Every structure is written in structure tokens, then in C-alpha cells.
Amino acid sequence: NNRYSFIGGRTGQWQVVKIRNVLGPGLQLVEKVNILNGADSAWRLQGFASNIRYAIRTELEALQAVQPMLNRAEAILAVLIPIKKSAQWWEMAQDERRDIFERESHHTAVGLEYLPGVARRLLHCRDLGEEFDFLTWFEFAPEHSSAFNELLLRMRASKEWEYVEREVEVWLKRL
Amino acid sequence: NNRYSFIGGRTGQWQVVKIRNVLGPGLQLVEKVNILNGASAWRLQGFASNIRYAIRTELEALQAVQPMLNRAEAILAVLIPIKKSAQWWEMAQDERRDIFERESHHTAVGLEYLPGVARRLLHCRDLGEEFDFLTWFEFAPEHSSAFNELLLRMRASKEWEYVEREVEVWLKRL
Ligand code: HEM
Numbered sequence A: 001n002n003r004y005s006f007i008g009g010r011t012g013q014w015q016v017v018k019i020r021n022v023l024g025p026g027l028q029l030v031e032k033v034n035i036l037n038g039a040d041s042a043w044r045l046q047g048f049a050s051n052i053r054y055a056i057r058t059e060l061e062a063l064q065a066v067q068p069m070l071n072r073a074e075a076i077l078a079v080l081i082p083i084k085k086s087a088q089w090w091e092m093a094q095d096e097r098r099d100i101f102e103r104e105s106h107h108t109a110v111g112l113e114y115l116p117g118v119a120r121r122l123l124h125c126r127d128l129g130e131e132f133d134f135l136t137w138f139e140f141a142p143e144h145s146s147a148f149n150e151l152l153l154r155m156r157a158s159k160e161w162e163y164v165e166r167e168v169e170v171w172l173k174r175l
Numbered sequence B: 001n002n003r004y005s006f007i008g009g010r011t012g013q014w015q016v017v018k019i020r021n022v023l024g025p026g027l028q029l030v031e032k033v034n035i036l037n038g039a040s041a042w043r044l045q046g047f048a049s050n051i052r053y054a055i056r057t058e059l060e061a062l063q064a065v066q067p068m069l070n071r072a073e074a075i076l077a078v079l080i081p082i083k084k085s086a087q088w089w090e091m092a093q094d095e096r097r098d099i100f101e102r103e104s105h106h107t108a109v110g111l112e113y114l115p116g117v118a119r120r121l122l123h124c125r126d127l128g129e130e131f132d133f134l135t136w137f138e139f140a141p142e143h144s145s146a147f148n149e150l151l152l153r154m155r156a157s158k159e160w161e162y163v164e165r166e167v168e169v170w171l172k173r174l
């Protein structure tokens, strides 16, 4: 099953360290997040794992060579980052979006510099009618915390991020 | 709302003319199809979504000539659920784009059939449906022959070597 739900509330596998309401309406602070594979709580986010939309074969080969698995023993820290991009983004053609995502913003090339420390999972949810477009998930050991914070500053300055209209960070610790 | 459901059964806006079970398991013949914007013998559903392959110049060409849905003359339609293979879905984005257009010329061929044929593309693989896409075409009867020719051109393409299941539900507006 390709559907995942993230329930902000009082139960779950993950303790909420902090929530940063980066842009637009935030998410209510809660004690924990419960993650269910499938479709007292304060909010629910859901999304699906999907096929590749932008990465080219050589980029997949580079990612496959180095990206770590989810659920490593040392990956006790995580961050759930729901993101919404603008109508102007979604109206663009496929070449126009690819050009912004990689040619201008270097999303893949830049992210690669933070592997293997950072593991990730990408879910999509615009097509479900959700309030966000994407749920991004990152997990890593404390030793990569500083590197992940650097990555966030670099991505938020990119051309791609000029099309982001809502964004929240839910910082988590594995219970 | 971006979700559409197609219910094969006794009620609906469309009378079934015939069903051709082109490849793989078919769909049960029924009297009518009921189309509902939102989430009898069978139900198919899918969502309208962003562009996945077409480039700007292709969209400009399509926008220059493609007709709208619900033309008064467009009393015939064809619902074509399609599933593609796992090997297709594993390919990277450039690999699929190259097959879809550089090799199979999906948009360039399809454009030869506008403005006669109007269309709508729905996606459903991500919903866990048994098909990956619901495709919808509609047109006046004078384009029936051209549309049957288009179908045979597409099925000869490299892109169609990855199609694993395909049904045609032919319909007439009530
Ligand atoms: C950690 C290293 C990272 C790597 C290796 C990476 C890589 C990728 C790749 C290859 C894709 C495209 C997948 C496809 O073709 O469909 C993607 C999508 C995306 N990534 Fe990252 N990423 C990283 C970090 C980040 C971070 C920190 C964020 C958010 C703050 C982010 C947000 C996104 C978004 C929103 C998308 C969807 C883009 C779209 O479809 O418009 N990524 N990522």
C-alpha cells in the first residue's frame, strides 16, 4: 500500500521536538506523531508514494549509489516537511518545471551532497485534495543535524522555493 | 473537485454501445455509465492532474486547436482505461518522455485528430486502482472512422509495448 498518514496528537512512534511554521498557516503543536501505512488528535496529513516526475536516469543512478535505507539504527532524528507550491507552478509545462527544479535550483545535485547522512521519503498529496502538495520526510543521526540545517537554508534560497506558498517543519525524535 | 467516478450499471448520462476487451481482463457489459465528479457491475475512478510530459510548445499547439468537452455535436464517446507495466513505471523521467514523444509521437499524432476529438486524461495508479489511467474521448459521429484509425496508430507505437490492460467502453449521450 502506497498511502501513508501522519497523525499529530498524543500517541505515536515519534516525539515532536518542535514545529516551525515556515510559511503560511501552521500546524498545531502536539506531543507526538503517529505514522500509519494506510488511510485527542489535532491534524492528519496523508500522501502517496509515486513514480519519478523529474529525475533522469543518471540522477537515479547517482541517488541509488549512495542513498541510505529508512529505519537505520542511528537515524533517531526526523523532520516531516509538508509543502505546497503555487498555482503558477502547477500551470507550467513539464520542461519549464524540470528547468526550475534542476537546471536552475540543482535540487538533486545539492541534495546528493547530504547523502548518505540523510535518508528521505517523498509523498505526493495535491492529487488527493489535501491542503499541502507534498509530504517530505528526512531522517538522520544527530551527527548530521548541522548538515541538514545547512541544506534547509540552501533550498529555501533557491529559485524552486520562489514557488512555495505554504510550508511547515515538524521536528521529531524516535521513541 | 478533481475526482471522477464512472459506474457501469443501469443508470447514467451515457448509454453503452459496446465494450471491446482489447487486452487483459475485460469489463462486464452494462446498460449505462454514470459519471460523478467526486468519490451496478463496476466502478472506475481517477483524478485530473498536472502535466507529466508535454513541453510548453506542445501545450501551445494543443491549446491552439483542442476542443472543449460538452460540445452539442459530441454525442459519441469512448472511455478507455489503460494499465502500463511495472517496467514502464520503473523507468526514469527522461526515459519515459523519450518513449512517449521522441519515439511514439503521442502528442504529434494525437494533434492530427483535433479539433474533431475532445479528450480528458485521468490518473489512477496512485489511487491503487486496477488501471493506471482513465482516458476519455468524445466526438461527433463523422469522426468515428478517424478515431478508430488513431487507436490503431497508437497501438502500433513503442509506448504501447508497455500497455498491459486496455478496454474500450463506447458510449452515446442520452
Ligand atoms: C536530502 C537530500 C535530498 C535529495 C537527495 C532530494 C532529492 C529529490 C529528488 C530526486 C526529487 C524528485 C523526485 C522525482 O523525480 O519525482 C525530489 C523532490 C522533492 N524534494 Fe527533495 N531532495 C532532498 C532534500 C529535500 C529537502 C530538504 C526538501 C524540503 C525542504 C525537499 C523537497 C522536495 C520536494 C517538495 C520535492 C517535490 C518536487 C516536485 O515534484 O515539485 N527535498 N527531491
Ligand code: HEM
Pocket (backbone or CB within 6 Å): A094, B050, B051, B052, B053, B054, B080, B082, B106, B107, B109, B110, B111, B113, B114, B117, B119, B121, B133, B135, B137, B150, B151, B154
Ligand atoms: C485524441 C488525440 C490525443 C491527444 C491530443 C493526446 C494527447 C496526450 C497528451 C498531450 C498526453 C500527456 C499529458 C501529460 O503530459 O501529462 C497524453 C497522455 C496519455 N494519453 Fe493521449 N492523446 C490523444 C489520444 C489518446 C488515445 C486515443 C489514447 C488511448 C488509446 C491515449 C492515451 C493516453 C494515455 C494512457 C496517457 C497517459 C500517458 C502517461 O502518463 O504515461 N491518448 N495524451
